[PDB]
Here is the input.
Amino acid sequence: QAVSKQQYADANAAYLQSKAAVEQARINLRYTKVLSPISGRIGRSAVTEGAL
Amino acid sequence: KRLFKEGSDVKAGQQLYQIDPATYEADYQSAQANLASTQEQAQRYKLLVAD
Here is the structure.
């Protein structure tokens, strides 16, 4: 009873939001490493170093 | 009031006089109000430090 159910709610609320955000951050970071989807022969690169 | 007959017989413990209690009765009820308050306040805080 040291704290209202409301407070604990708001709390666990933010906690979930965070956990969410981190997961999304993790995924974007992982994508900074573009990977080949299948073993095979690869040709010319259309994009060029430094490009956007 | 002076509730006794001059020259009468009184029993030990018998009220002989009555001093106007208006305020004393008042301060007392006041005091108790306060206590009832603070007491609760404390009893609650005693469980909050606990956590």
Summary: Chain A touches chain B at residues 1-2 (CB under 8 Å). Helices of chain A lie at 5-30.
